[PDB]
Amino acid sequence: SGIVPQLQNIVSTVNLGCKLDLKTIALRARNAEYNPKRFAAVIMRIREPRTTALIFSSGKMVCTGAKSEEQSRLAARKYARVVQKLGFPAKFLDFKIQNMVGSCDVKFPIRLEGLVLTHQQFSSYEPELFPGLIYRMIKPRIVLLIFVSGKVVLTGAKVRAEIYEAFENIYPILKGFRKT
C-alpha cells in the first residue's frame, strides 16, 4: 500500500556510568522537576529535539518524545552534556532504543466487532471500556490499536522494520473487514 506509518514516539535508555546527586541537578540545571516523595527522579525537558528525560541517581536515564533514532540519540547526548556541565563525570554507555510508537490511517472504516470475533486468539475489544481494538501480533511482537475511524497505532517495536512489517501484515485483514 501507499500508506507509510509515521513515527510518533521513541523511548530509549542509556547509562551515564556514574552516581548522580539529583538534588544538585534539580537546583542548578534548567527545566527540571524533582519530587522524591512521589517519584525518585529528575524530570528534565529540552526543546531540540523536543524530548523528556527521566534521570535517576544511579546514572541510568530514559529519553522519550523523540520521533527518530538520531533525534533520540542527539537528545540523550544533550542531556548527558547537561549532566556533564554540572560537574559530574558522565559517560555515554550502552545506548539502546527500548520502545517505538507510530501511527497511520488506512482511509476506510473497519468492522471492529467482526475483527474481535474472528481473531479471538490475538485480539480483544470492549467498546464501553476502550473504544478501540487491541491486536497483539506475534510476528513481529507488536501491539496495535485499531479504531472504527481507520486510524491505526503501532507500539512495542525495537526497530523501524518491526513497525513497517506489522502494518504490512495487518493491512489485508483490515481490507477484508472494511465497512461497505
Partner 1 sequence: YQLYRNTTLGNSLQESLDELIQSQQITPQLALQVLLQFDKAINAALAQRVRNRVNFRGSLNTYRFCDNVWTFVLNDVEFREVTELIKVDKVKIVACD
Binding residues for DNA: 9, 45, 60, 99, 136
**Under rule CB under 8 A, residue 30 binds partner 1:** yes
Q: Which of 180, 155, 143 lies closest to 101 in space, CA to CA? A: 155
Is-contact 80 90, C-beta < 8 A? yes
Which of 23, 107 has the CB closer to partner 1?
23
- Scanning 9-17, 27-35, 112-120, 124-132 for contacts with partner 1 by CB under 8 A, the matching segment is 27-35
The number of residues making up the chain comes to 180
Q: How far is the CB of 146 from partner 1 (least distance, A)?
A: 37
Does residue 26 bind partner 1 (CB under 8 A)?
yes
CA distance 125 to 145: 10
Pick from 139, 129, 140, 168: nearest CA to 152: 168
CB-wise, 6 or 31, nearer to partner 1?
A: 31
**DSSP string for 151-166:** EEEEE--SSHHHHHHH
Quick one: 14 or 55, whose CB is closer to partner 1? 55
Q: What residues numbered 31-50 form the site for partner 1, per CB under 8 A?
A: 31-35
Angle at 1 between CA 172 and CA 103, to 5 degrees: 85
Q: Tell me how far, at minimum, the Cβ of 63 lies from partner 1, in Å.
A: 19
Question: Which residues lie near partner 1 (CB under 8 A)?
Answer: 23, 26-27, 30-35
